[PDB]
Amino acid sequence: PQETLNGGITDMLTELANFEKNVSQAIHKYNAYRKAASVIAKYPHKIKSGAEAKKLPGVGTKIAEKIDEFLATGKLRKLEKIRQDDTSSSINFLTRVSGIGPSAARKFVDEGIKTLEDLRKNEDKLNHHQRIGLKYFGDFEKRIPREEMLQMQDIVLNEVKKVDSEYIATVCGSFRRGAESSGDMDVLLTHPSFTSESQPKLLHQVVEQLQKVHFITDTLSKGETKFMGVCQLPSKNDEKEYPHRRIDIRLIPKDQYYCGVLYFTGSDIFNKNMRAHALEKGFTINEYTIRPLGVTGVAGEPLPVDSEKDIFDYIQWKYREPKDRSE
DNA sequence: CCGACTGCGCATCAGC
DNA sequence: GCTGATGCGC
DNA sequence: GTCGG
Numbered sequence: 129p130q131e132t133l134n135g136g137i138t139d140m141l142t143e144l145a146n147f148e149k150n151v152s153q154a155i156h157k158y159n160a161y162r163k164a165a166s167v168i169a170k171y172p173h174k175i176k177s178g179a180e181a182k183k184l185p186g187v188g189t190k191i192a193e194k195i196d197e198f199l200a201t202g203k204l205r206k207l208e209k210i211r212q213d214d215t216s217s218s219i220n221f222l223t224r225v226s227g228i229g230p231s232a233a234r235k236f237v238d239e240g241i242k243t244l245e246d247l248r249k250n251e252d253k254l255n256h257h258q259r260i261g262l263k264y265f266g267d268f269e270k271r272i273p274r275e276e277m278l279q280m281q282d283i284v285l286n287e288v289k290k291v292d293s294e295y296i297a298t299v300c301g302s303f304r305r306g307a308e309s310s311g312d313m314d315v316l317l318t319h320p321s322f323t324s325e326s327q328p329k330l331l332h333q334v335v336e337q338l339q340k341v342h343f344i345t346d347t348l349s350k351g352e353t354k355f356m357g358v359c360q361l362p363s364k365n366d367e368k369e370y371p372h373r374r375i376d377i378r379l380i381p382k383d384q385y386y387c388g389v390l391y392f393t394g395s396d397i398f399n400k401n402m403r404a405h406a407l408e409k410g411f412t413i414n415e416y417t418i419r420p421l422g423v424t425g426v427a428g429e430p431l432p433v434d435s436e437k438d439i440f441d442y443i444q445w446k447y448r449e450p451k452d453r454s455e
Numbered sequence: 456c457c458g459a460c461t462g463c464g465c466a467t468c469a470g471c
Numbered sequence: 472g473c474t475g476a477t478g479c480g481c
Numbered sequence: 482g483t484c485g486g
């Protein structure tokens with residue numbers, strides 16, 4: 129877990145993972161490559177051979193021999209050739225625009241659209257989300273200093289309580305994990321009249337207020353229980369404007385807060401793993417509930433969290449505080 | 456050999 | 472008009 | 482791609 133220990137290898141595997149997701153559209157190879165990259169990143173030795181790497185869970189014959197080629201040459205012919213391929217590297221680049229996934233990137237590249245400038249020249253072919261991701265392309269790849277996160281949280285908390293005192297608003301994600309920077313802002317939201325009962329307008333009013341005071345600036349998606357959009361800190365004197373930022377709001381049944389906060393905290397690789405073996409344990413976890421598997425695939429009446437969680441005791445693992453949840 | 460693989464709300468697309 | 476499937480990014 | 486039925 130020392131980073132320069134096997135960074136070349138895990139770099140290589142992460143680049144392979146991205147090519148599989150964005151170009152081959154092979155999501156399970158993508159996950160396989162990332163699981164291998166992850167397990168190797170936590171391995172406390174410098175790998176000397178593919179055979180050594182193959183001992184780790186999630187490393188197999190194919191990654192083993194990619195490793196031997198990489199150790200033997202410091203390169204991978206397949207990646208070498210892929211990077212040089214105009215179609216493939218354009219498809220992969222385009223997926224960095226929010227809203228453009230592997231399918232859209234492919235469709236765009238097939239009709240001659242390969243760069244940010246081609247997209248701008250072709251805004252008719254873009255949907256609402258895609259135009260916004262293009263508009264804020266740079267900003268959306270910028271990190272948010274924790275200091276700004278705190279200002280953002282002040283505004284969110286302040287404006288939420290205005291709408292209705294009984295709302296609860298939690299800022300989750302890496303911020304809740306104490307990170308000194310974040311890629312976006314995730315707001316977990318609950319209201320006492322949302323558990324089992326419902327009025328289905330609680331989220332709309334939160335959103336509307338945040339737009340009113342010019343905090344939220346764009347909408348990407350907006351439904352009953354989930355908002356995805358764009359927001360922005362106000363600026364000062366002649367102050368340089370802050371970057372536009374991605375913000376999501378999830379409205380959970382108050383019934384199910386703890387499962388909500390575990391999941392939106394998370395981290396994404398951490399939920400994959402926490403859920404992946406929870407399957408081993410005879411359980412399945414989502415943002416709503418933890419449930420057992422009784423027969424050979426069961427639901428199970430999910431009765432209510434009583435205390436903190438010990439979701440973790442149910443699947444028999446020690447509590448990793450949000451700080452230790454990057455993995 | 457061959458299927459599972461973490462889990463899901465909303466926008467859009469496919470179709471009746 | 473509608474239902475159901477898929478893409479997308481969580 | 483990897484793991485396991």
Ligand SMILES: Nc1ncnc2c1ncn2[C@@H]1C[C@H](O)[C@@H](COP(=O)(O)OP(=O)(O)C(F)(F)P(=O)(O)O)O1
Nearest residue numbers: 301302310311312314391392393394395396399481
């Ligand atoms: N496929 C998934 N499965 C489970 N949880 C997920 C998944 N994808 C995303 N989540 C997440 C778990 C995740 O914690 C939460 C928010 O997603 P985020 O904002 O993309 O991830 P973080 O905020 O942690 C970040 F570190 F990447 P940031 O600081 O750069 O924004 O839903």
Ligand SMILES: [Mg+2]
Nearest residue numbers: 301312313314
């Ligand atoms: Mg985030």
Ligand code: NA
Nearest residue numbers: 182183184187
């Ligand atoms: Na292995």
Ligand code: NA
Nearest residue numbers: 223225226228
């Ligand atoms: Na994208």
Ligand code: NA
Nearest residue numbers: 312314376481
């Ligand atoms: Na997010």
